[PDB]
Each structure stands twice: as structure tokens, then as C-alpha cells.
Amino acid sequence: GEVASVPLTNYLDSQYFGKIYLGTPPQEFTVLFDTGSSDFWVPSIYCKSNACKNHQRFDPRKSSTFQNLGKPLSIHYGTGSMQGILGYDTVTVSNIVDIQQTVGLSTQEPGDVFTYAEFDGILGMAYPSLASEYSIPVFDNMMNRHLVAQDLFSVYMDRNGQESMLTLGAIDPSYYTGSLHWVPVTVQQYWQFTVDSVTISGVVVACEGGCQAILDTGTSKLVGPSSDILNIQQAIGATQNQYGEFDIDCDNLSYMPTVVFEINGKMYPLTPSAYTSQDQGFCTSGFQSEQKWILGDVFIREYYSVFDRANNLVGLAKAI
């Protein structure tokens, strides 16, 4: 029964990553904590990809606790794919010591996706129903062994890009305003629930009649169906860029409309500032086109999210 805090760092609003140790004695990796997947892995000294050479490599020859499993793991991140082998070893996350944890060791990480990414590996935080065969999610282990105070974790993303925190086994009233609203998980694979509508000024622009949505820390954007997401870009005044993007004048921020998600009868609005990314005097739409909605960091930045595996619920409160 414990509580770990894992301070998140942001690679620019796009990647929220944290440190974990693998092995005996412990090797340090930076992990993207991903509610959109269930598998855990790191690059290995058996990877000769340039993405691997650019990152931290697990050296199993340096770990007394290491145990090859043989079992293979294949995953997709972005347009990129990673090849690896399942192994066991001990993982420390905060003061939480997770023994004998299945971990993937990359053998193959081709392309630029992984190279330029800030994280070395990914730690998956969705249901085991989504994990690879022979792979046991980290949070399931911690739960199975009563390593956590409670069966839940909490994520705060600082908009202000500084104070990001992952909370294992606990809920922290300090990172939100108001009360938390509990949201029942509909389908237990992703962290999925029903959005009732998407509104601008009382007009349903999207998710007419209700819609399925997943809370995804591993996604930077607000992702949805093409048809709906274009009515939102026309509505906020996002024009396609030449590079393929949707641009927004940083100036016009003032008169742009607020997008409101109604979820379980409560409304969750996003102002232009929340959905608008600004890089070097270029502003970008937080909305992106894919049937299901992916509420990524864009939403999480505004909304402290609790994931409840005890009760299988989502709690949401307005972030600080």
C-alpha cells in the first residue's frame, strides 16, 4: 500500500515523460507514461538502430536480476514500429519496487520517429486486454501485489509547462479546482467512456447523439472523425497549411470560440488558448482528424484526470 509521485517533464506539450529504473543495480530510462497502450519497453544493447544509439540502452549483462523470456514484442508509436524481446527484471518507479516485471528490450527501432523522440521507452497504462501476449502491465503487477495505496493513478499536466506530476495510488486536491466528476468506463481496454455532445454556443457541431472517447496521455492532440473535426476547424477559423497543418493566427485568439465537451452531463470547455498551440509566432490547431474521439494532452492540460481500476471510472476536475 504505497504512493509514488513521478514528476513529468515535457518535450514541448507533445511528450510527457518521466524517469524509472530497470535492473540490479538500477539503470535509468525516460519513459512516456501512456494510457493509450499497456506494454512496457526500453531500447536494449541488442538494438543497433540509430534511434537506439541516440538513447539509453538496457544492458542486461549489468543486471543481476535479468531474465530473458525469449517472447517477442511488436508495437506501433506514430508511424514508427519497434521489434523487441520480452524479459523479466525489477523496475523501480518512485519508491515503488516492482519485481519480476515483464519488460520489452528493443531489437529494432527503424526510422526517425524514435530517434528524435525525447523518451527512451514507453510505459503503457491501459487495461491488460490491450497488452501483448506474455506481457503484464506494470500497474497490474503493482496492484496484484498491493504495492499501491489505492487502485488508481492521477495525472496533472501543467499548461505552464513546469509542474507535471504522475500520482500512483493517490488523488491530490492541490492540482485541481472544484470537485472531481466520476465517469464510468464503457469498454475496458482503452480508458473509454461516452461523450454526450460537442457544442459551440449551444450548437452541436460534433458528436451528434453521443460518441465514444478515450483519454490518451500518449496523444498530444484532440483527435476525432474527419467530418466533425473539419466543422470544428472551419468554426475556429483554422486554415490548412502548405506543410499540411491547420494554422491559426495567434492574434485572433480573442474572438475565437470555446469548444465545449459535455461528458456525463457536465460540460468541459476548451478555450482558444487551450486548443491553440503557439510555436515561434506560428499558432496551431489542437484538433486533428483520424469513429472514436481521442482526448490527448490538449484536454488533459485543462483537466486533471484520475484513472480508477478499482471502480473502473474516470474522474475529471478542472486543473490548476
| Domain residue limits at 301 | 172-319
Distance, CA of 297 to CA of 16 (rounded, Å): 9
Distance, CA of 243 to CA of 101 (rounded, Å): 43
Task: Please state the φ and ψ torsions of residue 170, each to the nearest 5 degrees.
Answer: -150, 160
Q: Which of 89, 216, 228, 297 is catalytic?
A: 216
Resolution (A): 2.2
Distance, CA of 167 to CA of 217 (rounded, Å): 14
305 and 162: one domain? no
Q: What is the residue type of 98?
A: D
C-alpha grid cell, residue 129: 486486454
Residues 6+ apart with CB under 8 A from 10: 16, 17, 157, 158, 161, 164
- Final residue belonging to a domain, choices 171, 188, 216: 171
Q: Which of 65, 50, 64, 60 is nearest to 85 (CA)?
A: 60
Distance, CA of 19 to CA of 17 (rounded, Å): 7
Would you list the DSSP string of the chain?
-B-EEEE-EEETTTEEEEEEEETTTTEEEEEEEETT---EEEEBTT--SHHHHTS--B-GGG-TT-EEEEEEEEEEETTEEEEEEEEEEEEEETTEEEEEEEEEEEEE--SHHHHH-S-SEEEE-S-GGGSPTT---HHHHHHHTT-BSSSEEEEE--TTSS--EEEES---GGGEEEEEEEEE-SSBTTBEEEEEEEEETTEEEESTT-EEEEE-TT--SEEE-HHHHHHHHHHHT-EE-TTS-EEE-SSGGGTPPPEEEEETTEEEEE-HHHHEEEETTEEEESEEE---EEE-HHHHTTEEEEEETTTTEEEEEEE-
- Final residue belonging to a domain, choices 171, 194, 222: 171
> Is 260 in contact with 269 (CB distance < 8 Å)?
yes
Q: Which of 13, 34, 39, 120 is catalytic?
A: 34
Domain total of the chain: 2
The residue to which cell 525516460 is assigned: 30
156 and 39: one domain? yes
> Is 318 in contact with 228 (CB distance < 8 Å)?
no
> Is 290 in contact with 226 (CB distance < 8 Å)?
yes
Give strand pairing partners of 263. 195, 266
Q: Is the preceding peptide bond at 272 cis, omega within 30 degrees of 0?
A: no
| Distance from the first to the final alpha carbon of the chain | 27
**Per-position b or e across 176-210, b if 16+ CB within 10 A of its CB:** beeebbebebeeeebbbbbbbbbbbeeeebbbeee
CATH number at residue 24: 2.40.70.10
226 and 154: one domain? no
Give strand pairing partners of 177. 318
Is 228 annotated in the active site? no
Burial class (CB in 10 A: 0-12, 13-18, 19+), 64: exposed
Within 10 angstroms of residue 239's Cβ, the number of other Cβ atoms is 12
Experimental technique: X-ray
**Per-position b or e across 72-88, b if 16+ CB within 10 A of its CB:** ebebebeebebbbbbbb
203 and 102: one domain? no
> Is 146 in contact with 2 (CB distance < 8 Å)?
no
Distance, CA of 62 to CA of 82 (rounded, Å): 23
Give 212's Cβ-side CA count (13 Å radius). 10
> What are the Cα distances from residue 234, in Å, to 72, 256, 275, 276, 314?
45, 11, 14, 14, 31
C-alpha grid cell, residue 299: 484536454
- Final residue belonging to a domain, choices 125, 149, 171: 171
162 and 179: one domain? no
Is 216 annotated in the active site? yes
Interrupted backbone of the chain, residues before each interruption (C–N > 2.5 Å): 290
Q: What is the residue type of 22?
A: L
The residue to which cell 484536454 is assigned: 299
